[PDB]
Design a protein around this ligand. Sequence first.
Ligand SMILES: CCc1ccc(C(=O)NCC2(C(=O)N[C@@H](CC(=O)NCC(=O)NC)Cc3c[nH]c4ccccc34)CC2)cc1
Ligand SMILES: CCc1ccc(C(=O)NCC2(C(=O)N[C@@H](CC(=O)NCC(=O)NC)Cc3c[nH]c4ccccc34)CC2)cc1
Lengths: 328, 328
Amino acid sequence: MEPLRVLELYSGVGGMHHALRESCIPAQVVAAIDVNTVANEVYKYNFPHTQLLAKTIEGITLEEFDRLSFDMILMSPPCQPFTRIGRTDSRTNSFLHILDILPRLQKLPKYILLENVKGFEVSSTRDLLIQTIENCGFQYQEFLLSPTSLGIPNSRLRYFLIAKLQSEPLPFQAPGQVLMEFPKLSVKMLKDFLEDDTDVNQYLLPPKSLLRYALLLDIVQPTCRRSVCFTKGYGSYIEGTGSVLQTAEDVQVENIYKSLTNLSQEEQITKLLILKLRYFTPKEIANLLGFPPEFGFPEKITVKQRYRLLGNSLNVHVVAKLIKILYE
Amino acid sequence: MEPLRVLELYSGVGGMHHALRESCIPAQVVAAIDVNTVANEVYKYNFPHTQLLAKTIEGITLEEFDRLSFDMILMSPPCQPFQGDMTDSRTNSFLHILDILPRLQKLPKYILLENVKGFEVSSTRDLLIQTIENCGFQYQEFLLSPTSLGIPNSRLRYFLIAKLQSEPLPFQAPGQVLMEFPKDLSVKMLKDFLEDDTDVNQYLLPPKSLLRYALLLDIVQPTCRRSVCFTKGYGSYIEGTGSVLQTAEDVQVENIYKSLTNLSQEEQITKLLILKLRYFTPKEIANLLGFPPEFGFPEKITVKQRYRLLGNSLNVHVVAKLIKILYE
Ligand SMILES: CCc1ccc(C(=O)NCC2(C(=O)N[C@@H](CC(=O)NCC(=O)NC)Cc3c[nH]c4ccccc34)CC2)cc1
Ligand SMILES: CCc1ccc(C(=O)NCC2(C(=O)N[C@@H](CC(=O)NCC(=O)NC)Cc3c[nH]c4ccccc34)CC2)cc1
């Protein structure tokens, strides 16, 4: 009788929208707003029947906002575009316009849920945002949660703020506190998130990369229940970007390591290849991020862009549970 | 106990040597080893009477390690700004260290290593631990940030302290990485780490960058008792590299935020300059890192080079306490 109209800011590749669906709450995306042409392509490919406003948030007038009549705002960080080799940030103005439009709306949205990076919870920008929603009478709670809490073998500590237009306090509210756990199963293995049709070749680490960074790598095996944070650089830079997968069981990493001693560069390359280390594929990162099994990219989107498009994405599973918590 | 001869691997700017002096333990550095020309100039400038071997660790033979007759190994991550021979020396150096340890005529009694967080779950750590266990060392790993000693800087790093002895360490937690020092410390303000000589200009934030990233910034005031991790990119890349300092006072950050609303680019740029945001100086970062007041660079070192040389540096104060804990 009362389906929620949802506004998705910085829709990117549609992580929020996907979280909306997994929450199984009565809602629908009335509008997606993002200027990234490559991201929007990914968005249409997975959400063809959803309106996508390819505009900056600052360029969307209050009249348009009132017309959309949204009851829920969902926003996650903007996709970091591969700058055209020749080589603008509307973020400050877009964020200010959001703060400026909210009090002037004809219908305040009942729900607000924002996902940002860790560290935001101490910024001056947070204090101004919190200040505005308090003036508008939102009861809120901030979180810092990693998908490991929901049993996903992937570290991705991110910031969350859930806001609800109600006078009463929230049942789980810790005033002035960032909660580190969901309000009151285990960590699955990585093999559950691996695509079995993936070309193991092509994704195998190149030999010169193995030679230089072999012992600086974080090598995980498929039975491992852990993996490090993925950044936009995965697949192009090797240090600090993510874990790599050893697709050659019954070979012990520490044995390859010790046997490299007193070997030539060529013999080490030959030895390290035995481990059959490979990158996680873009689709496999999306699995760990919680994108639905049906999620995919247009073929025109390069592998490099796919890693980049996912590097800054939210975790659909973590956001989906908070949506449920927020909706009761 | 008689005077301890200390070996400093990947000396860099000499954080390990500065920590040894702050430990106030009977020891001196008989050999500093690093191949970075820039870093070694800084090392010579501060420690002119210390032997500095500008060679790769893999290149130092066993007899020369035996002839050095060291009782303590201190190793810190290489300066990592990234020698004619084309060869990454990291792998062969680390494996060379492991292959030399058992073959030494004198095992060092003390071993202290500092590394980045995340190392404690690597296959490399496992091979390292295995080797020191088989050599008879008693060890304990830590993950400590300078805030545990009252320093207003976040910088979680990995530490391994090893000691050649039969008895276990009084604080030894087998199979655990301790997050506190084994059992004044009130976190001090950033005032006590700033330099009065510092030209507030020169380091002031430029207008172009203060317009794109103004609200993406972690702006800290001198009365604050906190700051984020500094990285090599600081002073060049704004986002994620470190906090920026607000020198103009009695001005409240959030007001300047709201006043950017509906203003033009040039009009916004003008309101933000009021905040008088400057970078932390390379020296000021060294103060937060714990380098002694006497620590300085040669003038020929560019400010850009000074920033990179400190990005991956250890914290002298935290290491110094562990050196004491180890010597007992
Ligand atoms: C140093 C720590 C810090 C401080 C501030 C911010 C931030 O966000 N200041 C607002 C901003 C924006 O437009 N922010 C964007 C997101 C963004 O840029 N994240 C950083 C990033 O991806 N860097 C590569 C919109 C947004 C999405 N979820 C949110 C939840 C709450 C408030 C705002 C948001 C004008 C610049 C971030 C980090
Ligand atoms: C992903 C997690 C991870 C895994 C491995 C390592 C590492 O260390 N693999 C050894 C090695 C090296 O050369 N290690 C260097 C340190 C280094 O490069 N750290 C990474 C960095 O600074 N990234 C910006 C020397 C060193 C100093 N303290 C130590 C304590 C124990 C063992 C080794 C060391 C190739 C031979 C680091 C992190």
